[PDB]
Amino acid sequence: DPMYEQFLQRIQAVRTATVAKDISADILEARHDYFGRELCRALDIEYRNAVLLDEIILDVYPGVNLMEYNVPHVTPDNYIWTGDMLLILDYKVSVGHDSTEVTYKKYTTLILPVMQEIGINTEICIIRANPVTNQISIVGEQFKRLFPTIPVELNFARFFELRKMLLDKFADDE
């Protein structure tokens, strides 16, 4: 894939910490996205790369009077509308829980209040893949019920080797 080739080329070329950090960030984003794409495929849901909350409201209630509400402009990775419930979806790729809790608290306090005012039943769902062991952990009782089985086959090895190469190249930096 040119994904890896593009990244191998920037890593080979990079000479300073500050540009390497932007490469590091872009590796983790691509790792996140590859997870989200393989998830949405296995679950047959429309893959999206962030959706503005305002877009989400307007899809589930097109007669919304957007201007009459204070809608925080958060862009979660995706969403599912069941016709009766809204599930806000965030994909994580991580060995730890830290970012799952940060995002869970952020989306709970920023999304749910306006959806409660508008009258949309709403659940914050977060799906996390461990890059090392491939195991999937799910926040979202409604998400679990609607997707008890997740038929993804993942492989994060390219991403690990790119970031291992990047951080070997800058072992004695900061």
Q: Which of 34, 91, 107, 147 binds Mn ion (CB under 5 A)?
A: 91
How many of the chain's residues bind Mn ion (CB under 5 A)? 3
Q: Which stretch binds Mn ion (CB under 5 A): 14-22, 91-99, 110-118, 145-153?
A: 91-99
Q: Which stretch binds Mn ion (CB under 5 A): 50-58, 59-67, 82-90, 130-138?
A: 82-90
Residues found in the chain: 174
Q: Which of 40, 77, 122, 163 binds Mn ion (CB under 5 A)?
A: 77
Q: Based on CB atoms, which residue is closest to Mn ion, 36 or 122?
A: 36
Q: Should residue 90 be labelled a site residue for Mn ion when binding is judged by CB under 5 A? A: yes
What is the closest distance, in whole angstroms, from the C-beta atom of residue 98 to Mn ion in the complex? 13
Q: Should residue 123 be labelled a site residue for Mn ion when binding is judged by CB under 5 A? A: no
What is the closest distance, in whole angstroms, from the C-beta atom of residue 26 to Mn ion in the complex? 15
Could you please report the per-residue DSSP string of the chain? -HHHHHHHHHHHH--SHHHHHHHHHHHHHHHHHHHHHHHHHHTT----S---HHHHHHHH-TT--GGGS-------SEEEE-SS-EEEEEEEE-SSSHHHHHHHHHHHHHTHHHHHHHT--EEEEEEEE-TTT--EEEE-HHHHHH-S--------HHHHHHHHHHHHHTTT--
Q: Should residue 38 be labelled a site residue for Mn ion when binding is judged by CB under 5 A? A: no
Q: Which residues bind Mn ion (CB under 5 A)?
A: 77, 90-91
